């Protein structure tokens, strides 16, 4: 909601708008009683079906007729330091309207808050969370293979052991090393050496450096021991069945 209120700056200075609280969005119904209740609270302003009327003298409504009840709350243009009245009606709408308002170019701008995607869309990953790309977990498991990777590979794996939506669409920005643009399956295919050298030097951000320094240290220690044993030709996606006994033995040797 803080962005909703602060968006008044985004809309040009002085441009007319309306303090529109979508209390009952598009839910049609004869609501003269609701008008009376809104008056009982006391606002004197309302807009239904996109047309403004006073709560003192609202229009007639029928159940059959669509009624987009976004009550006008206050009379304001984009003013300077009007945050007092703005917030006054704005948190009010954030409850009555339940979190949504609009400052249209009545003289457009929509002051709405939506989760996941900013536009209220669905996401391959609901947010920037690693488990979202875990097919061993149901997050990445395909509908038709459940993470196994088979139906003949399942139609929604096609080689990648991951959901197509959570393959690269929300995770194609891995700027590891140079030209870095990787899908989860792409890193999987990155051999031991490929991925290790990719992560040896990569620029993804300062907060990412801070919160993935431990990641780099663990990986580089693991790879240093892996080289101390002389094991790089195995790939990150290489089938675990390739373990020759000595392979996992060296894995544990490095670990210990």
């Amino acid at each position: 909601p803080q962005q909703i209120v602060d968006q008044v700056l985004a809309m040009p200075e002085g441009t007319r708008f309306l303090v529109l609280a979508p209390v009952v969005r598009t839910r049609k119904g004869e609501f003269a009683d609701l008008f009376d209740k809104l008056n009982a609270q006391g606002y004197s302003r309302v807009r239904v079906d996109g047309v403004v009327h006073p709560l003192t003298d609202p229009p007639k409504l029928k159940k059959q007729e669509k009624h987009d009840i976004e009550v006008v709350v206050d009379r304001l243009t984009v003013k300077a330091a009007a945050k007092r009245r703005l917030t006054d009606s704005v948190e009010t709408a954030l409850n009555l309207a339940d979190g949504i308002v609009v400052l249209e170019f009545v003289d457009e701008q929509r002051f709405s808050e939506k989760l996941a995607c900013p536009n209220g869309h669905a996401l391959a990953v609901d947010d920037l969370e690693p488990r979202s790309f875990s097919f061993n977990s149901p997050y990445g498991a395909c509908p038709e293979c459940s993470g196994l990777g088979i139906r003949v590979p399942c139609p929604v794996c096609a080689g990648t052991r991951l959901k197509p939506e959570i393959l690269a669409v929300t995770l194609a920005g891995e700027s590891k090393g140079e030209h870095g643009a990787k899908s989860i399956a792409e890193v999987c295919e990155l051999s031991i050496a490929d991925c290790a050298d990719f992560l040896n030097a990569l620029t993804l951000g300062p907060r990412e450096q801070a919160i993935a320094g431990q990641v780099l240290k663990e990986i580089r220690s693991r790879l240093g021991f892996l080289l101390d044993v002389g094991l790089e030709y195995l790939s990150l996606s290489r089938a675990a069945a390739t373990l020759s006994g000595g392979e996992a033995q060296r894995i544990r040797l490095a670990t210990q």
């Binding site: 909601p1 803080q2 917030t87 488990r131």
Partner: protein, 286 residues
């Protein structure tokens, strides 16, 4: 003992073991059994919420002219209140999100900056202090503050006498040791005007209290008993019992070998009777 006293005075319904009778309840009103148990297992509760001074400070902030003009309740100023809690933290200050494998890391929130509030509420600066600041300064600083106020003054005086006031006012209950919680409980009961007719039974509280913490608790119980309170504590500390004006030492021998008063009276009296080994110890002392 505890079973019978609690069920006869506090209305408990626990099993009284095997005793023919108890007397002297006529000289008492309601017992209190206290131990090391933590006061609160969640950060939700905090020193303010436990002590009950929280709503008092909330009303204090409501007393600002800015609070008047906004026209909103002491609950508004709260930190466990829906409206005033920034969604970025639910007004918890930092932002928390983590999975099972590894622990989280504290991160100040745009709203908070550690303020565990919302600036909308913090705009009031009652007595030149925001709600964040008021909840910030720890017990001793709050004590030297709020001087002409009364109930908060009694709370803070109790805590100052406890002498552990260093604890942050918003210090999470989970971030407080069992002995610290014990001191909090004895402080809270120190502010209930029982006239001393009540009696406190207690475990061995050495854990969670340093030597000085034990001395502070000793002063607390001294004030209680001078206010008329009775007390009985199981304790392996010779100093604590020698400070207690009377001793009842039970048990000729450990385990089933005990089960009867071997000696009692003033610590010195019980000491003069070597029927207890604790008595032998109180004898070699003094």
């Amino acid at each position: 003992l505890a079973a019978v006293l609690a069920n006869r005075l506090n209305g408990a319904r626990q099993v009284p073991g095997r005793h023919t009778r108890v007397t002297g309840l006529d000289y008492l009103d309601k017992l209190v059994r206290v131990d090391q148990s933590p006061i609160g297992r969640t950060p939700r509760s905090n020193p303010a919420t436990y002590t009950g001074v929280f709503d008092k400070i909330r009303t204090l902030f409501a007393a600002t002219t800015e609070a008047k003009v906004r026209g909103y309740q002491p609950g508004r100023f709260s930190f466990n209140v829906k409206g005033g809690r920034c969604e970025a933290c639910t007004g918890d200050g930092t932002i928390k999100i983590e999975m099972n494998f590894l622990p989280d890391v504290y991160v100040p929130c745009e709203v908070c900056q550690g303020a565990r509030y919302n600036r909308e509420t913090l705009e009031v600066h009652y007595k030149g202090k925001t709600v964040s600041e008021v909840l910030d300064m720890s017990i001793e600083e709050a004590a030297e503050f709020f001087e002409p106020i009364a109930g908060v003054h009694r709370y803070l005086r109790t805590l100052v006498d406890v002498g552990l006031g260093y604890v942050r006012l918003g210090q999470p209950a989970p971030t407080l040791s069992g002995g610290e919680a014990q001191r909090v409980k004895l402080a809270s009961e120190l502010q209930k005007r029982s006239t001393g007719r009540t009696v406190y039974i207690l475990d061995e509280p050495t854990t969670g209290l340093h030597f000085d913490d034990i001395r502070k608790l000793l002063n607390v119980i001294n004030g209680l008993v001078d206010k008329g309170n009775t007390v009985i504590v199981i304790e392996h500390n010779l100093d604590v019992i020698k400070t207690s004006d009377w001793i009842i030492d039970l048990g000729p021998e450990g385990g089933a070998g005990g089960g009867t008063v071997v000696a009692q009276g003033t610590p010195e009296d019980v000491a003069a009777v070597p029927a207890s080994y604790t008595g032998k110890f109180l004898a070699e002392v003094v």
